[PDB]
């Protein structure tokens, strides 16, 4: 039940378990999450998407000898998303972007 940058980062840097309130795009999409609807507050009155998996071969986030990268929605309540998005890696390095997957400033 968390959707804030540092809050999610701390949660992950300390408990590593994705905040109890996130879902992978697939699950969200397969559960019924549709773009021409943005259904979410109904089936999940307070949940934020996030928890997918990515290798970052595009080198869009910090890398090394084999790096794992995953994202998560931020600042959501009930309705649709916005531009606040958090990025966390295998090593738990967390970065933040507020321009809809555009500028990734580091936070942890």
Curated annotation (Swiss-Prot):
It is found in: Secreted. GO terms for cellular component: extracellular region. The keyword NAD does not apply. The active site is at residues 71, 100. Keywords: Endonuclease, Genetically modified food, Hydrolase, Nuclease, Secreted, Signal. Introduced by genetic manipulation and expressed in male sterile maize and rape by Plant Genetic Systems and in radicchio rosso by Bejo Zaden. Barnase expressed in transgenic plants will specifically destroy the tissue(s) where it is expressed. After cell transformation, protein expression and plant regeneration, the active nuclease destroys the pollen producing organs thus rendering the plant sterile. Its main location: secreted. Its EC number is 3.1.27.-. It is an enzyme of class 3 (hydrolase). One of its GO terms (molecular function) is RNA binding. Hydrolyzes phosphodiester bonds in RNA, poly- and oligoribonucleotides resulting in 3'-nucleoside monophosphates via 2',3'-cyclophosphate intermediates. Belongs to the ribonuclease N1/T1 family. This is Ribonuclease. The chain holds residues 50 to 157 of 157 of the full protein.
């Amino acid at each position: 039940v968390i959707n804030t940058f540092d809050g999610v980062a701390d949660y992950l840097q300390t408990y590593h378990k994705l905040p109890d309130n996130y879902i992978t795009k697939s699950e969200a999409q397969a559960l019924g999450w549709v773009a021409s609807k943005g259904n979410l507050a109904d089936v999940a009155p307070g949940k934020s998407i996030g928890g997918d998996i990515f290798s970052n071969r595009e080198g869009k986030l910090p890398g090394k000898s084999g790096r794992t990268w995953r994202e998560a929605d931020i600042n959501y309540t009930s309705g649709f998303r916005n531009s606040d998005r958090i990025l966390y890696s295998s090593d738990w390095l967390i970065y933040k972007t507020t321009d809809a997957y555009q500028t990734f400033t580091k936070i942890r």
